[PDB]
Amino acid sequence: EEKEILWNEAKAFIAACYQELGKAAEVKDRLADIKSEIDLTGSYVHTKEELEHGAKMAWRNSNRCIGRLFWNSLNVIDRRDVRTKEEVRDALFHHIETATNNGKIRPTITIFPPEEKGEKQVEIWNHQLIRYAGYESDGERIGDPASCSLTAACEELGWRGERTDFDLLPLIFRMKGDEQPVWYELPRSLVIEVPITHPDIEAFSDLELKWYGVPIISDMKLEVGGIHYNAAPFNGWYMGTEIGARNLADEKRYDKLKKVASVIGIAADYNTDLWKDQALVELNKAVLHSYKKQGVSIVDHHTAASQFKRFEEQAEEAGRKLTGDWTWLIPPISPAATHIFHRSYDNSIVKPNYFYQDKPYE
Ligand code: HEM
Ligand SMILES: Nc1cccc(CCCNCc2cccc(OCc3ccc4ccc(N)nc4c3)c2)n1
Ligand SMILES: [Cl-]
């Protein structure tokens, strides 16, 4: 039980990790040191090299991610030494600052202590480290509907949002042995935000839309050789459609297409006018324009798919199977204008990888 699965994943991982690092000779002894450690202790501890390359492999294996060309330049921050809430908080603050990098975003992951055996050492409640709160009372909706349950969790613990449409949620996480999480307001100085303007349509600013600079996904588990890093927030830069075609456009999110139609001067009355499609394009142009104007990293979906084609080519050249989720790789805007749409992808799950895990709240 347990201890044998771990040993199994350890061999598979160390073998492949050391091959890729050109250290195949050291596999026998390292598996023989892991040998004993799992016997005596029930677990084993990755070297800094194994953990860094493991997190990079996990990104490379993420079937749904179009951005995987850059998997090998991931900036991995080893924070397995953290023991206190102040240290977790400061490491999360640090992640924001160094990932943001004044707008020239650095793909970064901060890795906290892995679970003991099932027991989390640190449990992060945020979905992303920077995200907007969401409210619904009396049928007035404010903010980001996808954040309603966490926002309400946060307000149970004594936080109170100003109830703008763009309240920054606090960092919220629980330590092993604490019954409740703590929360910390984000220092505003750390959070870049981009007002959404349009290159051509001066009135687009009347919408008073903004989005934050850096998506830092903080609720996924990193699995590396049987070790379960449930707390390992990571970030890339945005692909513009995530903001323009989903966050700001979806009916169950900010639902802005009808307001976009009005400010760009087209009627939103007939499906055959394709006003939603037109508003989608103009909003997505505005998002790319705005991030570029402010000097915040962003990629459009055409360039992203172009990079992903190079990832595919690199995989074949390296003899690695390519895996991918066609339904998530195609962009939600003009998908058939990318090569992705016109091919198929094996959706097999390879480890190391990032995985969903149950929310600690409800
Ligand atoms: C460098 C810029 C990056 C871009 C532009 C990018 C782009 C994306 C996009 C567009 C998605 C689809 C999500 C959606 O449509 O809502 C995605 C999924 C994903 N990306 Fe990336 N990504 C990047 C970096 C990273 C990094 C650094 C990691 C981890 C180290 C990562 C891991 C993933 C994972 C795990 C998913 C799937 C999440 C899920 O199932 O919900 N990505 N990526
Ligand atoms: N029914 C379907 C079918 C097909 C595709 C979809 C797309 C889901 C998008 N629905 C918004 C959303 C929900 C949950 C998680 C999300 O984020 C994942 C993620 C992870 C890492 C990223 C790294 C960089 C970056 N730029 N983005 C990332 C996004 C998004 N739904
Ligand atoms: Cl997002």
Swiss-Prot record:
Record's catalysed reaction(s): 3 reduced [flavodoxin] + 2 L-arginine + 4 O2 = 3 oxidized [flavodoxin] + 2 L-citrulline + 2 nitric oxide + 4 H2O + 5 H(+)
EC number: 1.14.14.47
Presence of the UniProt keyword Oxidoreductase in the record: yes
Main EC class the enzyme belongs to: oxidoreductase
Sequence positions that bind heme: C65
A single MF term (Gene Ontology): nitric-oxide synthase activity
GO biological process, any: nitric oxide biosynthetic process
Co-factor binding comment: Tetrahydrobiopterin (H4B). Can also use tetrahydrofolate (THF) in place of tetrahydrobiopterin (H4B) but binds THF with much lower affinity than H4B.
Names of the cofactor(s): heme; (6R)-L-erythro-5,6,7,8-tetrahydrobiopterin
InterPro entries noted in UniProt: Nitric_oxide_synthase_Oase-su, NOS, NOS_dom_1, NOS_dom_2, NOS_dom_3, NOS_N, NOS_N_sf
UniProt keyword list: Heme, Iron, Metal-binding, Oxidoreductase
Keyword Metal-binding (UniProt): yes
UniProt cross-references to Pfam families, sorted A to Z: NO_synthase
Family as reported in the entry's similarity comment: Belongs to the NOS family. Bacterial NOS oxygenase subfamily.
Note: This protein is similar to the oxygenase domain of eukaryotic nitric oxide synthases but lacks the reductase domain which, in eukaryotes, is responsible for transfer of electrons to the ferric heme during nitric oxide synthesis.
Self-association and partners: Homodimer.
Function: Catalyzes the production of nitric oxide.
Name used for this protein in its record: Nitric oxide synthase oxygenase
Organism: Bacillus subtilis (strain 168)
Lineage: Bacteria, Bacillati, Bacillota, Bacilli, Bacillales
Gene: nos
